Amino acid sequence: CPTHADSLNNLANIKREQGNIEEAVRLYRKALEVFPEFAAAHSNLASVLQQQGKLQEALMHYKEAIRISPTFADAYSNMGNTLKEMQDVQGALQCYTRAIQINPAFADAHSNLASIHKDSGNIPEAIASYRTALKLKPDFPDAYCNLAHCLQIVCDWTDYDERMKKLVSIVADQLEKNRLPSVHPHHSMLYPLSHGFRKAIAERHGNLCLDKINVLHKPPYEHPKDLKLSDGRLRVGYVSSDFGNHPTSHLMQSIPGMHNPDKFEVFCYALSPDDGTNFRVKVMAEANHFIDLSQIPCNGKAADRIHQDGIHILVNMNGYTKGARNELFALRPAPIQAMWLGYPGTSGALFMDYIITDQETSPAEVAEQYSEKLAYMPHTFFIGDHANMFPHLKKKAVIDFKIYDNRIVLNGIDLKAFLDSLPDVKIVKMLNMPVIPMNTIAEAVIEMINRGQIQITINGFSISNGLATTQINNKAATGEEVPRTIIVTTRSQYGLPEDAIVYCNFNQLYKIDPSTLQMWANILKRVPNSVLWLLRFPAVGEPNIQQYAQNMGLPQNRIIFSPVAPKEEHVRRGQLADVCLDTPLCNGHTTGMDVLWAGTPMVTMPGETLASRVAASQLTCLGCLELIAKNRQEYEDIAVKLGTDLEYLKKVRGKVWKQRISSPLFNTKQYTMELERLYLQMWEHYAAGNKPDHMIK
């Protein structure tokens, strides 16, 4: 019967919107039982199956719908979404373009096609496609919210104020009607939403994971309640898709190997395959046990594996990011599950017990922002492997083209040995600083930079052009290995002025909003001889920033843009700046550690979200409270004082250069120990028969 099958299909659509996916599947299947050749029911069934993580079964039903109805545009577009989730970009593209070819007015297909362009890095094409979708369907939350993020990425601030209003209005209407918000949980930190809204957005994304594991019908796991089976050792499992060349490994790759094997047994669960980098090698070698879960795509079997290892504390290092398999945590194969380091925000999910943070990053007065209980590290929860990855930057020398500490810089493992052969070198007290005069050697080095030569040899020592590291050693450029040569870094390499203050920020441009650039403009206006140093991250954002700066009274020559660089050059060239100006909307996190390792003072203004308070936490651990602003006026004043009072700048720069070593900020050994103390507090609390509570010491 036509009416019978139609009613079943349409009611199932209603159940789907209500969040009752199980009943939806049931009704779709009954529809197909009544009317086997029902194209709409095949396509609609495949959609809920997709939402349940049954991707291959979805594809089969999509193809069946299309066999029955060759011009079924909805089926093509929906199939594209499945192929995209399967990382089949070309297949997804072919489905979207076919759908658009069938129906050019198909708004959903345009918006879905836009997401491919967006994730490919083709932001202008994504923007154009999202605008086509909104032209066809003006009320379209997915298209509008993703378009807004596209505009954020390239710093397009056209009607930014009304954009923010619309975004907030959309999230409010979606949360009220119990829908999955169109704003991604990570992106929510960028918009003037309430903390309640941000946590609710996260919560609903965590609910997607529950939809995927509910169809497994797995019973709850029995959890260990003593350390007997592990000979008194606590079994900690680190779960990450980022064991490899990824900022996550650049921060914590030394941590598994530094755990005390008398009290801890380290399990690393990789969600990604081996990328062949030294980062992956190190973790595989230093972890007590390394498990490649990318070989076990079934979440039920993967969680079974974790449980069989007898993990006491499972650590989530992904949150809502690419490669995540939070279905593993939703299944609860471990009695204690904690968010750590990787994701700058709450999961919003019940299956996560703790978020490892600190008092500075996450004060108790903003604890409602998180769904997890707070677990405090004594200093900062943040860490970096800089001392291990870039020890060639521990010491430096300069060439006096006449004394500056950041115009022409040399670094190297054998730098001290090289300087021994140069008897005319002066040691200037600021650890102090060796200064090479304008001699034969210095002229040879400077000629190399001016002529774009790759490297030269002096007294047997290899002296490298800092721009040419990849041509000399690929592994050294990525941070996989320590550079062996003496490297030369100059302001001339990046078109930075020789006699002016350089304020820098090396973050992705999305972290900048109109209010931030305005604040930076106020600073530059008060420091006559000063420029702002930013990255083409991406390059298409550059003319936008320049325009808005000009409108704020800043000449175009006051802002200098450089390309993104390999990991090692990026950290190293931070030495050329005088001061880093941190982004208040969302701080530099990894990039914050990067700049401090270079010995460059960072000025910050902590907000309320976790992401906006990390830099202040780093600086507090470093021991430079004077670089933390309580408001915008103070942020500007601090930055201006550093740019105008040159003796104060010298003092602060010297303080950072010294304390990056002496403070616990880059001490991975101390970090691991304190992380261990925190793990034990978590365990004893649980072992005493208690539900998780704030471990705020």
Binding site: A40, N78, H184
Partner: peptide
């Protein structure tokens, strides 16, 4: 190369088809 960063996949929109 462009450096690896913290990345998020962009959500897509499924189309529900009503039967007539």
């Amino acid at each position: 190369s462009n450096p690896p960063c913290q990345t998020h996949e962009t959500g897509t929109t499924n189309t529900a088809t009503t039967a007539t």
